[PDB]
Amino acid sequence: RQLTVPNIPLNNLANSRVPAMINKMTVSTDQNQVVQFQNGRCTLEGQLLGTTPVSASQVARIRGKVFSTASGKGLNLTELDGTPYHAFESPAPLGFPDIGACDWHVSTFKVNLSGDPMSRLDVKQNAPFAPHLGSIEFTSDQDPTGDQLGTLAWVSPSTSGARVDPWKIPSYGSESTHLAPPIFPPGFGEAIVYFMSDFPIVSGNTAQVPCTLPQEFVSHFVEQQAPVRGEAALLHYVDPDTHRNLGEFKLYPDGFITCVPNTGGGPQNLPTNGVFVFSSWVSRYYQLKPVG
Amino acid sequence: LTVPNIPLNNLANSRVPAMINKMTVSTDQNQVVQFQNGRCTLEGQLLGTTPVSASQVARIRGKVFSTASGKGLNLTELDGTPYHAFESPAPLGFPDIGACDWHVSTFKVDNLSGDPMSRLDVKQNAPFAPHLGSIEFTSDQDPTGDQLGTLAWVSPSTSGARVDPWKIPSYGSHLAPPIFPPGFGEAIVYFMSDFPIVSGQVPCTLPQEFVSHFVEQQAPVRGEAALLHYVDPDTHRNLGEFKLYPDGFITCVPNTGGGPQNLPTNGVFVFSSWVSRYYQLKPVG
Ligand SMILES: CC(=O)N[C@@H]1[C@@H](O)[C@H](O[C@@H]2O[C@H](CO)[C@H](O)[C@H](O[C@H]3O[C@H](CO)[C@H](O)[C@H](O)[C@H]3NC(C)=O)[C@H]2O[C@@H]2O[C@@H](C)[C@@H](O)[C@@H](O)[C@@H]2O)[C@@H](CO)O[C@H]1O
Numbered sequence: 001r002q003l004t005v006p007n008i009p010l011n012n013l014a015n016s017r018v019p020a021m022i023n024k025m026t027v028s029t030d031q032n033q034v035v036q037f038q039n040g041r042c043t044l045e046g047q048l049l050g051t052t053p054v055s056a057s058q059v060a061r062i063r064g065k066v067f068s069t070a071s072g073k074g075l076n077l078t079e080l081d082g083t084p085y086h087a088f089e090s091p092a093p094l095g096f097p098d099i100g101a102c103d104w105h106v107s108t109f110k111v112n113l114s115g116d117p118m119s120r121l122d123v124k125q126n127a128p129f130a131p132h133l134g135s136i137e138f139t140s141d142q143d144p145t146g147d148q149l150g151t152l153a154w155v156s157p158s159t160s161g162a163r164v165d166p167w168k169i170p171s172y173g174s175e176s177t178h179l180a181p182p183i184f185p186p187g188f189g190e191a192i193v194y195f196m197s198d199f200p201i202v203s204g205n206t207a208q209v210p211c212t213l214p215q216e217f218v219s220h221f222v223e224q225q226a227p228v229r230g231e232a233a234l235l236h237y238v239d240p241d242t243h244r245n246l247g248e249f250k251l252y253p254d255g256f257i258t259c260v261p262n263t264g265g266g267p268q269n270l271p272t273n274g275v276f277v278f279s280s281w282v283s284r285y286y287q288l289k290p291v292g
Numbered sequence: 293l294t295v296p297n298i299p300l301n302n303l304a305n306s307r308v309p310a311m312i313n314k315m316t317v318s319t320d321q322n323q324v325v326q327f328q329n330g331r332c333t334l335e336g337q338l339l340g341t342t343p344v345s346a347s348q349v350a351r352i353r354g355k356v357f358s359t360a361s362g363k364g365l366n367l368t369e370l371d372g373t374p375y376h377a378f379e380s381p382a383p384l385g386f387p388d389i390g391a392c393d394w395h396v397s398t399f400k401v402d403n404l405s406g407d408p409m410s411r412l413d414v415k416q417n418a419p420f421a422p423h424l425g426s427i428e429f430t431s432d433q434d435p436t437g438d439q440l441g442t443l444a445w446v447s448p449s450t451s452g453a454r455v456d457p458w459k460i461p462s463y464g465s466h467l468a469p470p471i472f473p474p475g476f477g478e479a480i481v482y483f484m485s486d487f488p489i490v491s492g493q494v495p496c497t498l499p500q501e502f503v504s505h506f507v508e509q510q511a512p513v514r515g516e517a518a519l520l521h522y523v524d525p526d527t528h529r530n531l532g533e534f535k536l537y538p539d540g541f542i543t544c545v546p547n548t549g550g551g552p553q554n555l556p557t558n559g560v561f562v563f564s565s566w567v568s569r570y571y572q573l574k575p576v577g
């Protein structure tokens with residue numbers, strides 16, 4: 001099988017961290033910044049890593065059964081289809097959100113509905129946040145019971161003076177959590193390409209969430225199950241009307257994309273209607289032409 | 293030609309933001325539907341309001357403006373580019389769950405403070421004019437400016453009534469055409485998802501990833517129908533035969549008293565061959 005990437009323009013691609021559409025590419029202000037996102041992670045051969053699910057509609061979702069303690073309430077987590085979550089070789093159930101170090105606000109419904117079926121579960125990333133072992137605590141102004149299924153609606157700071165940094169991941173343990181490994185900028189002047197989406201972040205530097213692979217790229221790799229035939233895949237980002245090559249990018253086997261950004265610029269200066277196309281297999285050391 | 297190499301339970305609904313729970317046929321197997329989302333030809337032509345991504349499904353974006361009785365939205369496309377009242381029934385991705393109230397959770401696309409969410413309560417009555425590019429709402433919050441959001445739940449238009457999610461809206465005073473069962477014992481296959489419906493699952497005719505697959509591929513149609521096998525991914529056994537039509541829907545011949553609702557929900561659809569219109573399917577379920 002021959003490796004391809006989706007024939008879909010950037011703006012029709014979904015974020016792999018939050019339920020939203022991609023609106024631009026960028027590079028990090030610190031081009032040496034290392035990330036360890038647990039969603040949007042998939043090898044070129046189609047191996048899912050971390051908590052990464054297959055579908056865009058599994059991204060940043062939570063399902064579980066409500067339980068009561070002396071102190072309050074929690075969810076005993078299940079997979080999103082309701083099957084049992086077993087602590088094995090994943091940080092959390094598939095699709096579980098990976099926006100670290102902040103409060104989450106998750107809108108859920110009970111899976112004969114009457115009145116208002118929604119509950120907003122407010123979740124702190126403090127001590128009883130133990131998704132790896134299979135439970136989290138929440139508070140809610142509503143009264144959720146039983147089998148609740150929902151989606152991350154918005155995020156806010158853990159404490160009043162603080163901010164939300166969407167570039168961080170949670171601490172899944174309460175303990176080895178089987179995390180997808182860190183991603184380093186791989187040298188040769190290359191910077192990791194991040195795909196950004198608008199998302200309601202309260203007290204963030206911006207209201208945007210980065211990811212390292214568009215969700216449709218993930219499912220494409222899973223479907224295709226293609227053999228890696230080189231150290232990197234050279235891609236062109238192409239204008240779909242003129243077929244002009246707008247810039248060179250490298251797609252690495254571990255499942256992320258790089259470019260060489262022009263000083264003070266980068267892929268954030270490119271049109272957002274282009275399509276990535278596989279060009280050829282290249283050596284790890286292939287030197288890219290600068291973009292932006 | 294290929295269809296997505298992905299088990300059914302990892303496929304998304306194309307009419308609501310939810311995962312596929314199961315397949316079924318309609319109780320009345322001659323029932324005609326006209327869904328506006330989840331519609332795409334085999335060659336990759338989007339129809340109705342159907343978008344490419346599962347994260348565009350059943351979403352609304354617009355600018356808040358003042359109406360006679362309160363507030364409304366002047367619609368835009370989901371990416372914030374202007375909506376033109378033209379050939380589509382509405383902005384791409386606009387919900388198509390007809391004849392009911394909608395409850396849509398939105399945020400202001402901006403710096404945020406406090407509670408950034410508004411729930412827009414939308415009735416499909418006189419001012420509901422999505423083709424022209426406007427709808428009205430009531431809300432217990434105070435949304436302003438550029439609001440982007442997703443359908444959260446639905447309820448009855450009036451007290452005592454029931455929600456029928458098999459209906460589509462009236463878009464106002466290029467609708468995707470109806471899907472007719474083709475005859476010969478074949479029944480349209482509907483893909484069902486759990487979704488919060490007060491006083492009622494939501495059906496669709498193509499899982500969303502089938503749509504992006506067709507768009508992505510731009511495959512030539514080389515026969516009158518595509519014969520698909522539904523395969524157990526763990527034993528690799530063929531669990532049943534289905535036909536995929538060029539206009540973009542799927543059929544089976546359901547066994548009497550049964551049907552694809554009796555099949556496991558973790559199987560994978562696989563293209564087998566091109567067949568003629570009247571290729572007779574082995575019954576399933
Ligand atoms: C118990 C006590 O000493 N104080 C409680 C208040 O903190 C609760 O109201 C708080 O109002 C704050 C703003 O005026 C703030 O909204 C706070 O939580 C909110 O902000 C924090 C960070 O500062 C987080 O971002 C939260 O996610 C966010 N919650 C929202 C926006 O809904 C409010 O209290 C929060 O929720 C309570 C239950 C506790 O978990 C606090 O730690 C949270 O901060 C309110 C309690 O309901 O009044 C007092 O009880």
Ligand SMILES: CC(=O)N[C@@H]1[C@@H](O)[C@H](O[C@@H]2O[C@H](CO)[C@H](O)[C@H](O[C@H]3O[C@H](CO)[C@H](O)[C@H](O)[C@H]3NC(C)=O)[C@H]2O[C@@H]2O[C@@H](C)[C@@H](O)[C@@H](O)[C@@H]2O)[C@@H](CO)O[C@H]1O
Nearest residue numbers: 115116393394395413415430446447448449450451452490
């Ligand atoms: C008493 C007062 O001061 N004002 C009255 C309003 O409260 C009434 O609003 C209705 O409140 C109901 C709850 O008691 C209910 O929420 C109703 O809508 C709900 O039920 C309808 C079907 O009957 C739909 O299913 C709605 O989706 C559902 N809404 C939910 C669950 O949130 C309310 O009426 C709706 O909202 C009002 C403002 C109007 O827009 C109606 O057309 C809507 O149906 C109000 C009802 O007419 O009467 C006031 O006097």
